Amino acid sequence: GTFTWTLSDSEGKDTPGGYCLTRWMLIEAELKCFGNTAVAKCNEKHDEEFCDMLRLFDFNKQAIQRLKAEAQMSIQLINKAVNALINDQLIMKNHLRDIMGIPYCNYSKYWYLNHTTTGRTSLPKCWLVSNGSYLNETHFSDDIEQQADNMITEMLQKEYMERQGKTPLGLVDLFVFSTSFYLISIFLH
Amino acid sequence: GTFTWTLSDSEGKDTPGGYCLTRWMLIEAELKCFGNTAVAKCNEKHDEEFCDMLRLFDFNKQAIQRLKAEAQMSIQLINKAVNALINDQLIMKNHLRDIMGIPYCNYSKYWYLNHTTTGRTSLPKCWLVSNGSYLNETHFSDDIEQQADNMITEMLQKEYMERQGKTPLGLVDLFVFSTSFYLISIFLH
Amino acid sequence: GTFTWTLSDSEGKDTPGGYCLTRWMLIEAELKCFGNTAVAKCNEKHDEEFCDMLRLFDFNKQAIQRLKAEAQMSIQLINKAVNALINDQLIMKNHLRDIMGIPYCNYSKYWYLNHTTTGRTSLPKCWLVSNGSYLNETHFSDDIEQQADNMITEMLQKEYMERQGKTPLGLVDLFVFSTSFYLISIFLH
Amino acid sequence: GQIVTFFQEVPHVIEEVMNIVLIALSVLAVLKGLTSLYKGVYELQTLELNMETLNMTMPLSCTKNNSHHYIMVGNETGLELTLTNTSIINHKFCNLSDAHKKNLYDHALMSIISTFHLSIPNFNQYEAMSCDFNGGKISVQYNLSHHCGTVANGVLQTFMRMAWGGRGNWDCIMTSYQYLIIQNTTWEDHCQFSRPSPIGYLGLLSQRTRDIYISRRLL
Amino acid sequence: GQIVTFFQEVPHVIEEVMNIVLIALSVLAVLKGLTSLYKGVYELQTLELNMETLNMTMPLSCTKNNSHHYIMVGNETGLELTLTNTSIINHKFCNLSDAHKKNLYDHALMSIISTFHLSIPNFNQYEAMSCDFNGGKISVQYNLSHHCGTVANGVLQTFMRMAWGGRGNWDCIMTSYQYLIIQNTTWEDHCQFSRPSPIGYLGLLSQRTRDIYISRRLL
Amino acid sequence: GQIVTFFQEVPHVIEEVMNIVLIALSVLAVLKGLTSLYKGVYELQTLELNMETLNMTMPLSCTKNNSHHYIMVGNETGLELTLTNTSIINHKFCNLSDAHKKNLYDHALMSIISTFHLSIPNFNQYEAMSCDFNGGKISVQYNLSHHCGTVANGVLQTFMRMAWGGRGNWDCIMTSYQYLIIQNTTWEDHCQFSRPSPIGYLGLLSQRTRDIYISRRLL
Numbered sequence A, B, C: 001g002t003f004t005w006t007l008s009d010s011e012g013k014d015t016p017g018g019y020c021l022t023r024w025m026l027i028e029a030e031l032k033c034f035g036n037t038a039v040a041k042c043n044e045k046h047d048e049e050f051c052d053m054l055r056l057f058d059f060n061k062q063a064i065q066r067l068k069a070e071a072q073m074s075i076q077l078i079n080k081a082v083n084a085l086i087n088d089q090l091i092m093k094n095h096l097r098d099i100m101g102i103p104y105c106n107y108s109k110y111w112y113l114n115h116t117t118t119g120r121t122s123l124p125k126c127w128l129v130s131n132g133s134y135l136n137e138t139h140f141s142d143d144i145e146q147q148a149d150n151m152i153t154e155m156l157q158k159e160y161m162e163r164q165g166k167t168p169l170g171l172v173d174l175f176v177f178s179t180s181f182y183l184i185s186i187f188l189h
Numbered sequence D, E, F: 001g002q003i004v005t006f007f008q009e010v011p012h013v014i015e016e017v018m019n020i021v022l023i024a025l026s027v028l029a030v031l032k033g034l035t036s037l038y039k040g041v042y043e044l045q046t047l048e049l050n051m052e053t054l055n056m057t058m059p060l061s062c063t064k065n066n067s068h069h070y071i072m073v074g075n076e077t078g079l080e081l082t083l084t085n086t087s088i089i090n091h092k093f094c095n096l097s098d099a100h101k102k103n104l105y106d107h108a109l110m111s112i113i114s115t116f117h118l119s120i121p122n123f124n125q126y127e128a129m130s131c132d133f134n135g136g137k138i139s140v141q142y143n144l145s146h147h148c149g150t151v152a153n154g155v156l157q158t159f160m161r162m163a164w165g166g167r168g169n170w171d172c173i174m175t176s177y178q179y180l181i182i183q184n185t186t187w188e189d190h191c192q193f194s195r196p197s198p199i200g201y202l203g204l205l206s207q208r209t210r211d212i213y214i215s216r217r218l219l
């Protein structure tokens, strides 16, 4: 099967439905909020690693707030829900990339393109590690520009999908027919 | 992996390609027909429970009509095809919701928004059960309105996708260019 | 989980990002190039067989070029990556179709609609085999026309998605508002 | 051209009203030149799936009084799942290989109990489980004797994985019932409390062998 | 601006014809102011994938006369799968732990047969299977002796899971052949009947251990 | 109506410039009638996830000097993973069923090592593994003695499946270290080299029992 876990509501005013990472989650970086789009991106995607991690974060938060810690581990929940939280073969793909000798995902550092003015973010993706060191930002600069273009395309697409969802086709149809018939009237004039 | 089973053709005049549930399937409610859209909705979705059930229904129907009952069970087919019929971790998600103490799926009652005039239906989704009883319709009224809005958006989107599939971009392009050039001609006039 | 393997860059001038099959791959048919669209089609699809095969092809190519053959088999890679390369229950679906007695996928011959003038291809799909023989092209002619229509719709849709990705809504909006306000000015005139 | 139905449903959004206004202006100009009801029509009609229609391929789970759970396979055989203080079995055996030697049992029931036993999370105490298979009868008893981290916890977990019918916290569950009984029975309609459903067994098939402990290096 | 190719393919739909008409009207007004062939061009060109190109990573399945099935791993070793009335083995053993003790065999072949034996649906009779591994040779024989619900049913099921080459009904299959033989062999082109393919083994990997019976509580 | 932000990002495409030109023409006509910076604003801000926040539910893997690997479960217990030439264990036993008999150990650690041992690809030599569980302590040693196709290959494979910290080719890996040690320890911050992460164990859970050899027909 695939993952089925859903993200708990997050108490972020700017981002109502998107998992916001608190001070404790991010090392020496205070609190950052991502938004509903970035976290909901991988409700169909099986090839992203960071949103699986934040699903792990939300599962931990649920297990703490709505159960009792008891000071001893309950591996039952994680062993049962691991296939419901994360993809099962993405780690296999990164293990294979590692064996072959191409840069693989670290799973500790993740990089994202924070939009300075508006504060949107791409869904963070793994910082490739190779040869026992971090890849220079120059090495995968091409991937950085590809992700920037992906952000642009995805935000310009989601608004289209929202417009399609709210606006029926009978409107844009009867609009183009009416404008065409008025253009015909101008032709007659 | 994921499910791969496909729905057998259903002998419903109103709904040619959509699984129609007969009298026997629905307790004390005669026969209802859903349509191709509702049943085909979860050809990409992994988070719906009722269409997995109707895939089970169609698998049973195929096993009865195109094999022999023999009066003794053949668990081989169901044990082989269970991963090809239903999602494998959605039941895990509902077990977890049950353990935590939030309302979980019953898997017996399913509710849907029957459009009275046209007869369309949303894909039925599980009636949440909690605290040893059915949730009041008031409790998840918000989810009901969310599903109504989802029906509206999905029907206003599918017609757009059909128009995109049948109408090429060279048409809407050469149309907007021609209308713009005629507007330029009116500017010259 | 699902598949996560990605297709290695292919040295085809016509098709930069699409897996091109060389002379050795295709029996007595020289070299053919498919394109990025056909190979990328099943990055969300779980119901196609041929692109799983070409993922197997690319995995073999990677294992040969970037490891050492050593003349003895390394089943470790394939046993680890099989869930990352192919769907796990599509073969189950074809086994079931075989048991029931409907035509099933052979997994040797695949048919596709080569566009003669432009050279595009649909993603090849399995030639159904039944009753110990190949089905006549007349028998599944309906499926052939359905796939032709699917090619037409998918190519007319992908260009729409590309236009949506590159063109923002603020343009088409301010365009329709400006044209409407000019039509209002013509009404005043 | 079915805008009429949609228009009543969602005229609130500004873009729709703007579009309708522009269309009406263009039309006027060209002519001059020439119970549970949602929204307005959507209704909360509900389904009660008769799952007896799957009696020929799938086992169905339903219960009678929150203590007598059942699994029916076919229209001829089923099993009791009774939470009780009384033990029908007083020997700590499970003669599985003897059952396989004398293939006189029903394969469906043995597969049911195999799935049930391979889904018990972190099962490590084999003293609890007891079995009887003489004549093809399926009998399995469990001792729910116990702080948490006990086989009783996981065994109740897999019970409510299967039956889905049911003071414990933090993923630990306790019941006053000391024992549980699984045993063969015929088919009737004796599960007023719960509707029959197959989902318990299909979901239990997912987690089988997932949380198992290693007892041998080779396996 | 590649409308020319699409226009021939699908001009039937009313919306397209309306669009073209409107465009032609606008253009005229502005100028005044100033073998197997489908549709028309699509062809049923077919592919015959040479699966020998996967000889270096994947085992390929192909058969000669509908009774001699084969699995080739690499370009040096393969296995016979023969449905016959003759038994090469007359002892009911499978010395698997002895084979693992003396690691003188080919790992690919042992993994092949392990997958084959872990995909046998509801296997419960161990008397049928017989093995020989002396010297690294892979030999496995099966007794297909038998109404249904027999190990022969599931063993033929997993055969056609693997080979995909082949009067039984209701998910029960019977063959006149009493026995089946799996044994080591070299590589040739001796499978005229069937093209070599890996899909049988990859699919068999899916269902391994899925339908297995419990023989011990701890496992 | 947030076109202003997008316009700076991507004005290169011809269609956008054409649209803007047409809009400006229409507006003019109607008025007459009346560190690491990408693109211009996107920045490569990075995240360093403090995975200690998952100490209450998930085991975290981190290492100190590329030879001392660690797995910490909770904030009280963890395990050493040391590649060394020194053996703490000189007996070829693994008393797993004795450990299950006396349930005095931590369930998390036993599940960790069970997952570790069920993910070893094509494990066939049981002489290598040695275990100590007296008192609830978790000790597992591995002999990495060896051409390839050796248990050392797969055992290093599963090591770097778990720890992800590390001249061998063609999916064969060799190390000068003869032995490896897993043993119980308390919790500190002694893994300067590597950040703690759970991904090794979650990924190892995927491949458990996948590449296992059959040692018995019934299983």
Ligand SMILES: O=C(O)[C@H]1O[C@@H](O[C@@H]2[C@@H](O)[C@@H](O)OC[C@H]2O)[C@H](O)[C@@H](O[C@H]2OC[C@@H](O)[C@H](O)[C@H]2O)[C@@H]1O
Pocket: D215, D216, D217, D218, D219, E097, F094, F126, F215
């Ligand atoms: O644990 C294992 O997987 C193997 O352990 C070997 O040694 C045993 C110890 O584990 C301990 O239980 O004390 C008894 C020892 O025998 C077993 O020898 C080995 O059994 C296989 O080889 C012997 C053969 O007779 C059996 O049929 C095999 O199962 C365990 O696999």
Ligand SMILES: O=C(O)[C@H]1O[C@@H](O[C@@H]2[C@@H](O)[C@@H](O)OC[C@H]2O)[C@H](O)[C@@H](O[C@H]2OC[C@@H](O)[C@H](O)[C@H]2O)[C@@H]1O
Pocket: D094, D126, D215, E215, E216, E217, E218, E219, F097
């Ligand atoms: O079935 C099981 O999983 C355990 O059963 C225990 O009792 C046995 C009975 O099942 C029955 O077979 O009659 C013989 C009994 O021994 C086993 O003792 C237990 O074996 C483990 O503990 C003993 C040890 O010597 C073995 O190495 C373990 O496998 C079964 O797990």
Ligand SMILES: O=C(O)[C@H]1O[C@@H](O[C@@H]2[C@@H](O)[C@@H](O)OC[C@H]2O)[C@H](O)[C@@H](O[C@H]2OC[C@@H](O)[C@H](O)[C@H]2O)[C@@H]1O
Pocket: D097, E094, E126, E215, F215, F216, F217, F218, F219
């Ligand atoms: O391999 C198997 O699955 C069964 O093999 C049967 O025969 C054994 C041979 O495999 C070989 O190891 O030499 C010893 C033989 O016993 C076993 O008898 C059978 O064990 C079951 O039936 C006997 C019972 O005492 C055990 O508890 C069962 O495990 C193997 O399943």
Ligand SMILES: *[C@@H]1O[C@H](CO)[C@@H](O[C@@H]2O[C@H](CO)[C@@H](O)[C@H](O)[C@H]2NC(C)=O)[C@H](O)[C@H]1NC(C)=O
Pocket: B064, D052, D053, D054, D055, D056, D075
């Ligand atoms: C089990 O289900 C089957 C069909 O799913 C039921 O079979 C039908 O039973 C009715 C009883 O009046 C007959 O009229 C039909 O002819 C039967 N149809 C088939 C296809 O068998 C069966 O009744 C169910 N079992 C029980 C005990 O009710």
Ligand SMILES: *[C@@H]1O[C@H](CO)[C@@H](O[C@@H]2O[C@H](CO)[C@@H](O)[C@H](O)[C@H]2NC(C)=O)[C@H](O)[C@H]1NC(C)=O
Pocket: D087, D089, D090, D091, D143, D144, D145, D146
């Ligand atoms: C079920 O478990 C309970 C407790 O684990 C068993 O009760 C124990 O029985 C032994 C022997 O009869 C006594 O020595 C203990 O003092 C009892 N303990 C308790 C807490 O009652 C009970 O016997 C088990 N059931 C069966 C059938 O063996």
Ligand SMILES: *[C@@H]1O[C@H](CO)[C@@H](O[C@@H]2O[C@H](CO)[C@@H](O)[C@H](O)[C@H]2NC(C)=O)[C@H](O)[C@H]1NC(C)=O
Pocket: D093, D094, D095, D098, D131, D132, D133
């Ligand atoms: C399960 O197998 C054991 C194997 O020992 C059976 O125990 C034997 O049962 C017979 C039956 O009367 C007795 O004659 C023997 O003395 C028993 N042996 C021992 C060592 O006690 C056990 O009976 C089987 N289970 C069932 C329910 O029959």
Ligand SMILES: *[C@@H]1O[C@H](CO)[C@@H](O[C@@H]2O[C@H](CO)[C@@H](O)[C@H](O)[C@H]2NC(C)=O)[C@H](O)[C@H]1NC(C)=O
Pocket: E052, E053, E054, E055, E056, E075
């Ligand atoms: C197995 O496949 C490999 C490649 O997939 C074949 O190797 C090629 O064989 C031809 C034979 O004429 C040589 O010219 C090439 O140089 C080989 N290429 C590589 C990369 O090895 C091999 O021939 C196949 N096995 C058999 C028996 O045909």
Ligand SMILES: *[C@@H]1O[C@H](CO)[C@@H](O[C@@H]2O[C@H](CO)[C@@H](O)[C@H](O)[C@H]2NC(C)=O)[C@H](O)[C@H]1NC(C)=O
Pocket: E087, E089, E090, E091, E143, E144, E145, E146
């Ligand atoms: C394969 O199975 C058949 C039947 O299951 C075995 O034939 C039996 O052999 C025994 C002893 O030789 C006889 O007592 C039976 O009467 C036979 N039954 C039948 C139906 O022929 C056959 O021996 C098995 N093959 C092997 C190699 O043991």
Ligand SMILES: *[C@@H]1O[C@H](CO)[C@@H](O[C@@H]2O[C@H](CO)[C@@H](O)[C@H](O)[C@H]2NC(C)=O)[C@H](O)[C@H]1NC(C)=O
Pocket: E093, E094, E095, E098, E131, E132, E133
């Ligand atoms: C599989 O293992 C069994 C273990 O008993 C082997 O049986 C022994 O084989 C040797 C070989 O000559 C004989 O000397 C013994 O007398 C046999 N023991 C018994 C109890 O019969 C068996 O031979 C092995 N299988 C193969 C193919 O060698």
Ligand SMILES: *[C@@H]1O[C@H](CO)[C@@H](O[C@@H]2O[C@H](CO)[C@@H](O)[C@H](O)[C@H]2NC(C)=O)[C@H](O)[C@H]1NC(C)=O
Pocket: F052, F053, F054, F055, F056, F075
């Ligand atoms: C393990 O993680 C938990 C929370 O994920 C940490 O618990 C917090 O510890 C700080 C220490 O200053 C306290 O102020 C908080 O009140 C604790 N919160 C909770 C919810 O327990 C814990 O410190 C971590 N373990 C270690 C050893 O640092």
Ligand SMILES: *[C@@H]1O[C@H](CO)[C@@H](O[C@@H]2O[C@H](CO)[C@@H](O)[C@H](O)[C@H]2NC(C)=O)[C@H](O)[C@H]1NC(C)=O
Pocket: F087, F089, F090, F091, F143, F144, F145, F146
């Ligand atoms: C780990 O493996 C090595 C080699 O596999 C073992 O070293 C062998 O020990 C035996 C008995 O002490 C000698 O007869 C061999 O000559 C040794 N071989 C080599 C290559 O050194 C070593 O004993 C094993 N470790 C343990 C603890 O048993």
Ligand SMILES: *[C@@H]1O[C@H](CO)[C@@H](O[C@@H]2O[C@H](CO)[C@@H](O)[C@H](O)[C@H]2NC(C)=O)[C@H](O)[C@H]1NC(C)=O
Pocket: F093, F094, F095, F098, F131, F132, F133
């Ligand atoms: C694992 O189990 C074996 C079972 O034989 C233990 O071996 C016995 O250990 C005791 C402990 O002193 C000795 O008295 C026996 O003589 C041993 N038996 C044999 C045949 O050697 C072994 O000790 C256990 N492992 C550990 C670490 O205790």
Ligand SMILES: *[C@@H]1O[C@H](CO)[C@@H](O)[C@H](O)[C@H]1NC(C)=O
Pocket: A031, A032, A033, A034, A114, A115, A116, A117, A119, A121, F045
């Ligand atoms: C992005 O940058 C702004 C300041 O320019 C900051 O306030 C915000 O927290 C950043 N977002 C993230 C996710 O770091």
Ligand SMILES: *[C@@H]1O[C@H](CO)[C@@H](O)[C@H](O)[C@H]1NC(C)=O
Pocket: A136
């Ligand atoms: C990365 O850049 C640093 C300097 O910034 C340089 O010393 C190092 O060699 C570079 N690494 C690679 C792999 O090019």
Ligand SMILES: *[C@@H]1O[C@H](CO)[C@@H](O)[C@H](O)[C@H]1NC(C)=O
Pocket: B031, B032, B033, B034, B114, B115, B116, B117, B119, B121, D045
């Ligand atoms: C919806 O209601 C109509 C009558 O208003 C009825 O004919 C139809 O069967 C209903 N559909 C379903 C699925 O119940």
Ligand SMILES: *[C@@H]1O[C@H](CO)[C@@H](O)[C@H](O)[C@H]1NC(C)=O
Pocket: B136
């Ligand atoms: C549901 O509504 C009924 C009355 O319709 C009321 O008695 C009951 O308490 C309600 N349940 C909850 C959980 O509010």
